[PDB]
Amino acid sequence: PQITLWQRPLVTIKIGGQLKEALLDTGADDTVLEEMSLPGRWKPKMIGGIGGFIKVRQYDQILIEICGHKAIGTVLVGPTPVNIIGRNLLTQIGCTLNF
Amino acid sequence: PQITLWQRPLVTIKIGGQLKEALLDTGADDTVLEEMSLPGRWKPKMIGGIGGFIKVRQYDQILIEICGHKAIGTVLVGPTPVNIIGRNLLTQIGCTLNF
Numbered sequence: 001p002q003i004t005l006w007q008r009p010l011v012t013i014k015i016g017g018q019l020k021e022a023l024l025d026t027g028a029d030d031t032v033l034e035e036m037s038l039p040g041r042w043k044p045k046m047i048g049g050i051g052g053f054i055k056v057r058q059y060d061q062i063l064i065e066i067c068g069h070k071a072i073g074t075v076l077v078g079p080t081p082v083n084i085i086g087r088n089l090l091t092q093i094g095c096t097l098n099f
Numbered sequence: 100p101q102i103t104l105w106q107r108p109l110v111t112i113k114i115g116g117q118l119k120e121a122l123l124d125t126g127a128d129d130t131v132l133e134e135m136s137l138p139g140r141w142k143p144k145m146i147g148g149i150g151g152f153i154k155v156r157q158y159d160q161i162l163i164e165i166c167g168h169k170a171i172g173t174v175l176v177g178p179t180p181v182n183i184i185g186r187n188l189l190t191q192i193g194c195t196l197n198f
């Protein structure tokens with residue numbers, strides 16, 4: 001779909017059986033999801049942006065469906081204010097920026 | 100142009116007669132630039148990011164050329180990790196996400 005930027009580019013994703021609302025973010029190298037339980041083992045990581053840094057748990061090879069398009073990659077879980085889908089998964093669904 | 104997201108979507112912007120590099124950020128509602136001198140008055144603005152809130156200075160009606168496209172809008176100046184081109188300016192140059 002062609003998404004305009006008059007409003008926040010939010011989409012529905014499905015992970016671990018549940019459906020969620022996430023923000024497509026070209027500025028984010030990674031993908032961070034709000035506190036949730038995912039299977040597998042994790043590695044701690046610190047990510048920072050505006051406001052500072054937060055500690056997250058890094059899970060690899062996680063399967064996510066973005067607008068029906070399945071994608072697989074690293075997913076960070078932590079105290080983020082909004083679920084954010086970054087470049088690591090956007091490229092997998094063939095997302096591009098046009099102007 | 101069409102920008103893929105395999106690497107950071109960095110563009111050069113021209114502001115105040117000088118070139119700077121900025122990141123096209125669809126997850127950012129606003130445009131925030133690193134510390135610099137802009138003309139006129141500024142009013143305060145608190146913006147929230149990944150690590151919390153920061154206080155920035157807001158300058159309105161600022162001429163900024165992005166990748167050759169001229170835009171005139173609100174720019175926030177503060178302690179940001181990188182220059183961020185947000186949705187307020189992405190819509191002015193007609194930028195959309197496609198997949």
Ligand SMILES: N[C@@H](O)O[C@@H]1Cc2ccccc2[C@@H]1C1CN[C@@](Cc2ccccc2)(C[C@H](O)[C@H](Cc2ccccc2)NC(=O)O[C@H]2CCOC2)C1=O
Binds near residue numbers: 086126148
């Ligand atoms: N290293 C890098 O690429 O991203 C950092 C680390 C990371 C990892 C996962 C998800 C996000 C991020 C960070 C990003 C990615 N983009 C920004 C700006 C940035 C870019 C590069 C390096 C540091 C910081 C901003 C991000 O899009 C958030 C996403 C978000 C949306 C809503 C609430 C919280 C976060 N939006 C935001 O801060 O919004 C505003 C600033 C101006 O208008 C408001 C970040 O803070």
